[PDB]
Amino acid sequence: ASFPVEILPFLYLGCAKDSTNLDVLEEFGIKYILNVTPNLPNLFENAGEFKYKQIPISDHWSQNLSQFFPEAISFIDEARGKNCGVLVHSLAGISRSVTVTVAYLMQKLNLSMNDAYDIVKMKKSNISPNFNFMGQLLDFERTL
Ligand SMILES: [Cl-]
């Protein structure tokens, strides 16, 4: 019914309720998958035709997602550099994925959290995240 949206060329954001079918991904030229679903072990291996990455996030309130920004950005960038689609996805919702996406836009395009988020809303105006990551994104903004 619904598919991952291309935020920037080669950068895809998938909502939990999106069709993560392998054929659909091959068709979009997506070869890299960044899974930000919580409570999973750290992994980075090749899975079929894809380079699968899974970061060790915890859904506990004390968990800091921002610390994974550098490695997430490096992964997304390495994919886009090689002209390969990269997918940021979470089975738990849209919040962690859009947060990693916004962080990437902030650093890559040299934008503030608000500007980067507005860019995301241009391509996916329906998006409705929670506010659990405002503080981390605002804090990450200072880093730039
Ligand atoms: Cl999430």
From Swiss-Prot:
Disulfide bonds: none annotated. Expressed in keratinocytes (at protein level). The lineage of its organism: Eukaryota, Metazoa, Chordata, Craniata, Vertebrata. It is linked to Hypogonadotropic hypogonadism 19 with or without anosmia: A disorder characterized by absent or incomplete sexual maturation by the age of 18 years, in conjunction with low levels of circulating gonadotropins and testosterone and no other abnormalities of the hypothalamic-pituitary axis. In some cases, it is associated with non-reproductive phenotypes, such as anosmia, cleft palate, and sensorineural hearing loss. Anosmia or hyposmia is related to the absence or hypoplasia of the olfactory bulbs and tracts. The active site is at residue 90. Ubiquitinated by the SCF(FBXO31) complex, leading to its proteasomal degradation. It comes from Homo sapiens. The chain holds residues 205 to 347 of 381 of the full protein. It is found in: Cytoplasm. This is Dual specificity protein phosphatase 6.
